[PDB]
Structure 1
Amino acid sequence: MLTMKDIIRDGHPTLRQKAAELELPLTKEEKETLIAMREFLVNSQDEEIAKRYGLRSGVGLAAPQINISKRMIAVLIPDDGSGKSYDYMLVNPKIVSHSVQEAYLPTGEGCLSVDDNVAGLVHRHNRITIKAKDIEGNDIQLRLKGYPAIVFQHEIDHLNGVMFYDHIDKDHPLQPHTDAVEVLEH
């Protein structure tokens, strides 16, 4: 069972490296790792379990965050009320296309590897199309918008050694870009 002790903190060199592409099929160890990454999110979102193991609630996790420099991510965004939910374990995810229009969460973003909050808007693409493989090597192509698009971009960034605060404007951190879409926290 993965817990906060497995999540490396900001400053660790692995978080700034470029994660390595995965060869398909994945080995048994890599599959178990990806499943455990997803299980971590599940547990983090369970009030009782998260309390018992002092887990910080999260909706996404990238292999580099547990010191594994491989291009694998897990996203677990619960139903927001629209009936839409996102439960994906992706291998070699890549954004193949995206909108020019940007989007951002009004209160900024948080990271499991970053202990203290960092104020500032993180502008990302409002719409993206991702191609990736699933845990069994099959093909997956997602068309995402708004909140989920932001979460997947946050995770993919980890695979390229990019941290959310890298996007924050030094001078005007809370100034939304022209025509950027404000995404309600959901």
Structure 2
Amino acid sequence: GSDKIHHMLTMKDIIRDGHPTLRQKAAELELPLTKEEKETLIAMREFLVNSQDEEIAKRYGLRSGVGLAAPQINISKRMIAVLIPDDGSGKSYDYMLVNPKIVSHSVQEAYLPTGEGCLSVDDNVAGLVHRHNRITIKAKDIEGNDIQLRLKGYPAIVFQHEIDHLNGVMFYDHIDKNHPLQPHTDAVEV
């Protein structure tokens, strides 16, 4: 549930840290998806759309997000939605993915300088979350077609955050408790 920093689901449908489902390893899905699974993915994306719309988000008390993983709505299945709106350059990320898996991990690390938040986490944890600056993901889309993404920088970070949810990993598991805000030598600020 990467935060935005640049049935209609509502915030109570998003389980909170401490819920067991967030710590489980989600199930690989067979394609084609069931109708319920498709509706789930579509509703996860619609929640991000709603959360990004200033009026709808204010009207329904939504926290703005750019990613959501199915475990966060208590569905232990490997599905994520990422919706990073146009950053001003025309680059936009609108992907509903099934069984996403990182197949190439960039050695150079990158991090958001303010750390990371998560829609499932109300009590924020300070610290840099070092991630791969570049990644390649293989996944299936909602119709079971093949998608391979090459991502870098912020979008890479967002997808890594969401994929981590499928493995029961939260952003803070990456935080070095000894030197939380110290960037790794090689690391670059996103």
Secondary structure (helix, strand or coil) at the match of 1:26 reads coil
Deviation of 1:104 after TM superposition, in Å, equals 0.2
Q: Deviations over 1:80-135 (max 9, x none)?
A: 11210100000000000121110000000000000022110000000000000000
* 1:44 aligns with one of 51, 59, 68: 51
1:32 corresponds to which residue?
39
| Structure 2 unmatched ranges of 5 or more | 1-7
The residue that corresponds to 1:155 in the other structure is 162
Mapped partners of 2:120, 2:106: distance in 1: 28
Q: Name the SS for the 2:83 alignment partner.
A: strand
**Secondary structure of residue in 2 paired with 1:41:** helix
What is the deviation of 1:154? Answer: 0.1
Q: What displacement does 1:179 show?
A: 1.5
Q: What percent identity do the matched residue pairs reach?
A: 99
**Residue 79 of structure 1 aligns to a residue in which SS?**
coil
Higher mean C-alpha deviation, range 60-69 or range 79-88 = 79-88
Structure-1 separation of matches of 2:186 and 2:33: 42
Task: For 1:99 and 1:45, locate their aligned partners in 2 and report how far apart those are by CA, in whole Å.
Answer: 29
Of 9, 14, 22, which aligns to 1:15? 22
Deviation at 1:167, TM superposition (A): 0.5
State the shift of 1:148 in Å: 0.2
**Count of residues in correspondence between the two structures:** 183
Describe the SS at the equivalent of 2:124: coil
The answer on 1:138 being equivalent to 2:145 is: yes
Please list every run of at least 4 consecutive aligned residues from structure 1 whose deviation after the TM superposition is greater than 3 angstroms: none
C-alpha distance after superposition, 1:19-46 (max 9, x if no partner): 0001100011100010000000000000
Deviation at 1:14, TM superposition (A): 0.3
Q: CA deviation at 1:144?
A: 0.1
